[PDB]
Each structure stands twice: as C-alpha cells, then as structure tokens.
Design a protein around this ligand. Structure first.
Ligand code: PJC
Length: 286
C-alpha cells in the first residue's frame, strides 16, 4: 500500500514535536481536490538509525487492527513518510479542556474503557506503547476515542515480558512507572501504570494547573537542590501519589491507585480493568 509522494497534497501542519512532523495532506491522484484527507508523519533531519526505528514503527502499526487504535493507511517513498487516517476532532487532552462543562463521569468512563480495550489488544500483540497520555489519544467522535502516537512503541522479545530501552533524549517522567524511571524497564505493566495517569488526566479534564507534572512538582516541595528525577523516585518510593481529582468517583481513584502499585506484578491487567470500567460506566450499584 504505497502512496505516491506527488499525489499527497500539503494542506496544513497538524503538529511538530517528539511524535515527529505531522502534516495534514490530501491524497489526490485524480488531481481535482476530491481525495481523502490523511495525517502524514515524517522525521525531519533523520539519520540512518532514526529512519530504521521509523521503519519498525510503520511495521507495528501495519499489523495492528483495532477500532481503538488509529488506522494505518500506508507509506510514501519506500525521506520515508507514514500515512495514517485523519481524525479531525484532535487529541483527547484538548477535547476535554474545551468540552469539560458537558462531559460527565460516564462519558469519561466510556473513553477509559475504549483506551483499556485498545491496550488489551496491544498487549495480546506483545507490544508496549511506552507513552500513554491524553495528548496521545485521538477523538474519532463524541463516543469514540483511539490510541495514537506509536513513535516510542516496542515489540516485546519472544522470550521476555519486558523491554530495556537504552536511547538518548527526554522522557515524560511524570507519566512513567518507577522501574522505567530507575532502570529503563518497559512492559505491559508499565503501560498499566501510565494508564492510571491517563485516568487521572481524564478526571481532571486535563486541567493544566493540576496536571501530573504540576502536581508532582508541587509535591516535591519548595527545595530544588536535588534533580527532579531523583526527587520524583523518592516521592514514589515513600508511597506518594497523585491525589484524587475533584469530583472523581472513589472507585475510579481506587483503580488509579491499583495501576500505581509499586510492584509491576501487583498492578491489574488491562483484561481485568476493562469489565470494571464498564461496570462503573453503567452507573449500577456495585
Ligand atoms: O497532539 C498529538 C500528538 C500525538 N498524537 C499523534 N501523533 C502522531 C500521529 C501521526 F501518526 F499522524 F503522526 C497522530 C495522528 C493524527 C493527528 C491528528 N491531529 C494531530 C495533531 C498533531 C499531531 C498529529 C495529529 C491523525 O489524525 N492520525 C494520526 O495518526 N497523532 C495525537 C495528537
């Protein structure tokens, strides 16, 4: 499923960040502005090692088939461009901030359940996302979200249930499991930890003032003579966690705290979380 680079007409820039250079394009082979809109990712000034990692990302997405994972469309020029379905409602983070006044707990629990199903499917494929965050969730419609941004995703080794990542660059440390922060260990259970942070983001409607980073930076205290990563590990080791968001049901906060168990094996699986989020979405008494 090769897309000709001359048929991809540039419309606008969706964004530029760690997730690459993403452009909204029209795939117009007839050349009449009739074609479908697509999201096109490229790595700008990308060396042969970065391009090899990109080819790997493309192959993960190509083999993924879920209604709760953004749909792979194709590749362009084998420099290399990844072609994805375009979701015009944007990221979940911005949608929650904008429609907060009319999104209730049941609607937040519906998104949580969909993310959890997508993550259960990802785990059955032995793939670790490594960057679950509201920013990396796309809105398909009012009642449908999809997991996006597979730039950090890894396929687990055939004989191991964890992946050790030795790569340069900055990490979103305030979304990361303690074993990821301390020893660069990633797994389906470190994805469960980040899912607990996604739950916290949903129930704060992604309010920037009480974001995971703003909360943890406040918890550290007034003293800043210790590097943040060392202070964050100390906080987590002594049992400090993000607080219960205002108006967050007590049972949703109980699921967050379980996702944030210090031991990866003590964290619930996406399989076990899903039916519990569905039950909470129903509004039924437990
Ligand atoms: O803010 C973010 C940044 C992380 N994120 C994301 N990262 C990468 C892609 C890519 F594969 F297209 F490159 C897409 C993606 C869009 C995007 C839709 N809106 C944006 C805005 C910015 C960047 C990418 C997209 C899409 O429609 N289909 C996709 O796969 N999304 C969710 C939005």
């Amino acid at each position: 499923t090769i897309f000709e680079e001359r048929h991809l007409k540039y419309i606008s820039q969706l964004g530029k960040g760690n997730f690459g250079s993403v452009e909204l394009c029209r795939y117009d082979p007839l050349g009449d502005n009739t074609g479908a809109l697509v999201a096109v990712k490229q790595l700008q000034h990308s060396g042969p090692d970065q391009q090899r990692d990109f080819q790997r990302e493309i192959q993960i997405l190509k083999a993924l088939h879920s209604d709760f994972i953004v749909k792979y469309r194709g590749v362009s020029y084998g420099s290399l461009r990844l072609v994805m379905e375009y979701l015009p409602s944007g990221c979940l983070r911005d949608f929650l901030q904008r429609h907060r006044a009319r999104l209730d707990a049941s609607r937040l629990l519906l998104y949580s359940s969909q993310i959890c199903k997508g993550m259960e499917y990802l785990g059955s494929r032995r793939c670790v996302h490594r960057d679950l965050a509201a920013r990396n969730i796309l809105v398909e419609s009012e009642a449908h979200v999809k997991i996006a941004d597979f730039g950090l995703a890894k396929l687990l080794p055939l004989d191991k249930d964890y992946y050790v990542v030795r790569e340069p660059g900055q990490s979103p440390i305030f979304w990361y499991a303690p074993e990821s922060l301390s020893d660069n260990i990633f797994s389906r259970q470190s994805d469960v930890w980040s899912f607990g942070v996604v739950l916290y983001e949903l129930f704060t409607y992604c309010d920037k003032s009480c974001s995971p980073s703003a909360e943890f930076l406040r918890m550290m205290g007034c003293e800043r003579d210790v590097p943040a990563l060392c202070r964050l590990l100390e906080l987590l080791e002594e049992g400090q966690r993000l607080p219960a968001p205002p108006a967050c049901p007590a049972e949703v906060h109980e699921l967050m705290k379980l996702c944030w168990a210090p031991s990866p094996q003590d964290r619930p699986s996406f399989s076990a979380l899903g039916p519990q989020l569905d039950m909470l979405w129903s509004g039924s008494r437990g």
